[PDB]
Structure 1
Amino acid sequence: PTLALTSGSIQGTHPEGFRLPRPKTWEESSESALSKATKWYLLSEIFRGLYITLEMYFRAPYTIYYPFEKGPVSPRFRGEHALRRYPSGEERCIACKLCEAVCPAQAITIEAEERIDGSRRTYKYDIDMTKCIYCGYCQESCPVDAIVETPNVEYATETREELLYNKEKLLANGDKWEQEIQYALDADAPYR
């Protein structure tokens, strides 16, 4: 049976000893007047605070030396978008427009047609890196792993126009970063 008879609940029941005890008065302090005055006047806690800070003065700092050293990276790192390529040389991408649909920021622009050989490829593939959010749905959406994000981050540019990646810029990165992307994929294959 519950306390619904009294319009109460077991939830409304505060725990035993919930209420506060009586507050102390000046005659109910353990440390005598002289003991409290010495800590107060001689700055006992501040001097302890100083000493603990001085402990850290004799410890090795965490600082690393960029750009001579880099911080760690993971095979799942999401960085510069890049268009991959088959070993035989033919482009991996077959122009789903799965790319243009998933992209949350609408940073992917694809236009495609029949190639001369007839195999389905795309002649326009632009990424607005100023509009992208480096979400990662590029890499996840590809049924042929054609678009992947390299572990690169050092590509800051003077003019914003350089941040509009057309197909050739994406293909240049795909060749330039191919061996590195091999490290990333072959180290993340089991978990996908």
Structure 2
Amino acid sequence: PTLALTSGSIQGTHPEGFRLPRPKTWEESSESALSKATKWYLLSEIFRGLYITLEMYFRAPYTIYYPFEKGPVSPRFRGEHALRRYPSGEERCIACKLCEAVCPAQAITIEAEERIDGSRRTYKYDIDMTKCIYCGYCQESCPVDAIVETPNVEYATETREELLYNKEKLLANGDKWEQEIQYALDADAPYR
């Protein structure tokens, strides 16, 4: 038999002790008048508050001297995009257009056809680096690891035209950062 008889539930029932006791009056304060006034007139907690702040003055600060030092990075970090190659030198991308279809922001533009020697290669490949949200979906979807995000973050440009990376630019990044891409790929290969 449940408490539907009184339109009550287990959930509606408050725990024991839920009702507050009678609030104390001025005659039930444990502190004497002088103790309460010595703390009040001599700013007891403020002088403590100063003292705790002064403890920090004799501690080692946290600041690092960028650009002479860098904060930690991990192999999964997402930064600047780069198009990679095989060791033999052929471009890794087979113009499969997967990354273009995942890309949440539609930052990728791929135009492809059969190469001069028959290969399935891309002749136009742009990333609108001012439209990308640096999300890593293109990297996850590439079947041949052709498009990755290098750990670079220091590439701020004076003009916005310089942030429209075309296929020449991205392949030049893949050559520049190939060694660092291998650092991250070797470390985080099994986790993908």
Normalised to the residue count of structure 1, the TM-score between the two structures is: 0.99
Is the aligned partner of 1:116 residue 2:116? yes
Gaps of 5+ in 2: none
Which residue of structure 1 aligns with residue 105 of structure 2?
105
Q: CA deviation at 1:2?
A: 1.5
- Contact 2:138/2:147 (8 A) holds in 1: yes
Gaps of 5+ in 1: none
2-structure distance, mates of 1:141, 1:190:
16
CA displacement 1:67-97 (0-9 Å, x = unmatched): 0000000000000011011100000000111
1-structure distance, mates of 2:176, 2:60:
38
1-structure distance, mates of 2:120, 2:80:
25
Q: CA deviation at 1:190?
A: 1.2
1-structure distance, mates of 2:46, 2:99:
60
Normalised to the residue count of structure 2, the TM-score between the two structures is: 0.99
1-structure distance, mates of 2:131, 2:185:
25
Identity %: 100
CA displacement 1:6-39 (0-9 Å, x = unmatched): 1100111000010000001000000000000000
- Contact 2:102/2:141 (8 A) holds in 1: yes
Q: CA deviation at 1:189?
A: 0.9
1-structure distance, mates of 2:2, 2:10:
7
4+ residue runs over 6 A deviation: none
When the two chains are superposed, the root-mean-square deviation of aligned CA atoms in Å is 0.4
CA displacement 1:95-144 (0-9 Å, x = unmatched): 11111100000000000001001010000000000000001001100000
Q: CA deviation at 1:63?
A: 0.3
2-structure distance, mates of 1:31, 1:172:
76
Is the aligned partner of 1:73 residue 2:73? yes
